[model samples]
Target: SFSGYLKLTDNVYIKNADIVEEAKKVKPTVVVNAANVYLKHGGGVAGALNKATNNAMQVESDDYIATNGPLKVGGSCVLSGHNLAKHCLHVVGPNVNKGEDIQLLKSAYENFNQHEVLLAPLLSAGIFGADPIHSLRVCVDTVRTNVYLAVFDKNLYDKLVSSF
Candidate 1:
């Protein structure tokens, strides 16, 4: 089964929520907006076992724009609304291909010690687990390809380079 479904609910969990103190939320962590208003359990469909859930939703496609056809690159959207209980609105993760120069991409990410924006390898697409060379192919794909998104962090690159 391809296994996709949507559930609508008002329940969510914002951890260390600013009820009393400010919680410095870090970017670049595996999060799932399930079970609570924002704490979801995103991975379970094709479980080999014990894999942690990482995304907000597992839809048929990441094309949240509903274009109903092929998704063009870099067309991400944060739709505004009058939510029944919202004065502020924030949405996360319709993660699409980011078109950037490969070397500059290498430079910026390498110089920065860590990702303020998390890196999700295409293998993290929840398809194949991961293979180093396969992931490298994805890196090449990121800069050269158009529709698909495949990303890798410089830290991973550094480790591999030093190891060899």
Candidate 2:
């Protein structure tokens, strides 16, 4: 029972649902990953995606991040060969209280605009420890392209449902 849609712009939207379940409904052209400098998806949303794709994401992620990372905050790499989508945008986000997660996510979004559809998590909230509400709000506020944002988070989904 997922509902409540928040539109950031005419194109971008904030959705609430279990990421795993919501993902089944759409095959986005781009899947954004909340990654680190090393591009390892050991935990959180990254880990889940990697597992879902049977580690195929790892090969793609490593090729880019290993080739061009230890990415600084806000830095990103677009990798292909992902099972879920055409590409994966790996962005290094900030930890809680570091106060720069929003900026980094904005930067990542700015770096790529080719995709018309994208699926993303609450960046920096899963394992990085940023507040989900604030981090997600930033995503809705920062998107400039005419892309659809399918945001999937259990907490957010629950919040939306309970609010009804």
Candidate 3:
């Protein structure tokens, strides 16, 4: 039952839901994908977005990589949303074992401040092994604003709800 939102602070909320759907429903809103350096829309949040948009973003990402280079850490490359989110912001989260994981996690979330309405999954928390609780706090604090953040796992969801 990934379908709920709870207040964090100042009109910001944490959610457990299909974020891509939520993003589109919000109208003219953007969603953030936890992207790889190559910007491949293969798995996790990116794959869900790709599936929603009929892989238009995958092709776009491919071309972007072809024309440019791999997405740098803290990269803010955006992709066409088609019928999905109005815009999609991409950010590369760092490996938790690597140095500067804190700063890199903060850096990944900096672009989140640029948007008014965003649905960001926990950056680097899952596949990248970032500390979930710490990263979630960093995201909101770093943005210095608010967002609609989504968490999928029940344990993580409950933990975040209680933590906040």
Candidate 4:
């Protein structure tokens, strides 16, 4: 499962791309994105730690995480909240394959009441395919104050993603 692959921490340490990749393996029923991912850049070490803690705190008592994307094939491959949650849920994002940065942000907060958070510096770098420090700064600068951070999971990530 995609959720199994990940370690629930906070948005600061969480890796958006890694979580998304894990989600792909499960082919879940839905994808829940509880993160404020930065596709263009990332933050540094300090920023990285912040994201990890944010996600970790959200983990359920049973250690389950959230996610997005459908369990069935033919569903869109996308970043989701399912990878970050500890329970099962449904979450639509920025029109799936379409372009809607602003709209996506709105969806993130409006649909789930989730605060726009940032991700780990190293993880952010991997997601943006940029330098660690550069990505760290990017995540920090772009993240909303109300949002939290968490660590990335690689092992059990799909389990939570496909729970539905």
Candidate 5:
């Protein structure tokens, strides 16, 4: 079953299951979305989040209208007004074919460390095409708070469970 948790580090944990269903149980204070610089929220996890929140994510995406334009790689934006969680951390993962810099992903998580219960996915593993293990490592190493990682990939889940 994908209901158990695997401790990845001292504070990090990996939960193998569907993102939306599992996240509802965790009810984390902060849920981080694996997003792109454009904040399109069109496909992959972004799309799922938008539907889960009933388009709340898109409203938050529209709020970012600075003269500077789209967020840079590793940058993040916070969204609110959701039943599943109090806050949403939308992080711009590296663009596809960008060499999958794990450090950049870590910096995004580092930007926000105040939440007690943090929910994060395998960032950049979807549209950004980052390797699952590398992004998972970045998530575990960066977030110091209690983290619940939603792993939708069965192979990745098995690999992580067997290794740790």
Candidate 6:
């Protein structure tokens, strides 16, 4: 990680840090977890987060589904932080490689409006295959609150530093 901040706008900034480590931080309160439609925290940031919390979120999220129904693609749901943050917003991003509608890209970040301080990752750029650059762009352009992008990939970090 570069371990610094890149200012994008007065309300937005980017960070070169492990999202799970950064999200373990207290102030931000709301941490966005990029999840699949089933809300399984199987791998990537989601897996690491579940491990950090002792699988408490996975247990809680299981219940969340039983009551609220499985998450629809491109939609989001708020869940218990399990002491990770004040809230956890689980988002199912578009799978760009599978011809998944990238239009939902904005909604992924748009859900951040009510949070005071937010921490997010490059949505769907991982196993889902959306371009990292595209993910970063949608995140920066869509969310206009006090947000910090806790990016995990160094290659993506360098690209962001050069581009912005």
Highest-lDDT candidate: 6
Q: Which is the better candidate, 5 or 6, if ranked by TM-score?
A: 6
If the candidates were sorted by their TM-score against the true structure, best first, what order would they fall in?
6, 3, 5, 2, 4, 1
lDDT of 1 by residue, 22-84 (tens): 101222232111011121224321121112112223232233334453322212212111111
Full-model lDDT for every candidate: 0.23, 0.64, 0.77, 0.31, 0.74, 0.79
lDDT of 2 at 20: 43
TM-score of 6: 0.90
Please provide the root mean square deviation of candidate 3 (C-alpha atoms, Å).
Answer: 2.9
Model 1 stretches astray by more than 4 angstroms: 1-25, 29-56, 59-66, 70-117, 122-131, 137-164
Error of 3 at 21 (Å): 3.0
Off by over 4 Å in 4: 1-124, 151-164
TM-score per model over all chains? 0.23, 0.75, 0.88, 0.25, 0.84, 0.90
Model with the higher TM-score, candidate 2 or 4:
2
- Return the lDDT, model 6, position 126: 79
Global local distance difference test of model 2: 0.64
**Candidate 5 C-alpha lDDT tens digits along 5-111:** 77778888887677777657767677788777777888788888778988877776777644336877888877772765778888777755766565687777675
lDDT of 4 by residue, 12-62 (tens): 333334433333354444333322222211232222322443543233211
For candidate 6, write residues 1-164 as lDDT tens digits: 22367888877788778877776664357788888787889998899888888999899999988888888767889887776787888888887776888888887777777677677787888777887888777877777778888878788788977886
* Candidates ranked by lDDT: 6, 3, 5, 2, 4, 1
Please, what are the lDDT tens digits per residue for candidate 2 over residues 1-164? 22355655665656655454455456556777778778888988788878877898887777866667577876677776255666777767776655564556666556445555566666677668776666656665666555444445556656633542
By TM-score, is 4 or 6 better? 6
Q: After superposing candidate 5 on the true structure, give the runs of residues whose Cα lies further than 4 Å from its correct spot.
A: 1-3, 66-68, 98-103
Error of 3 at 131 (Å): 1.5
For residue 137, give model 3's deviation from the true position in Å: 1.1
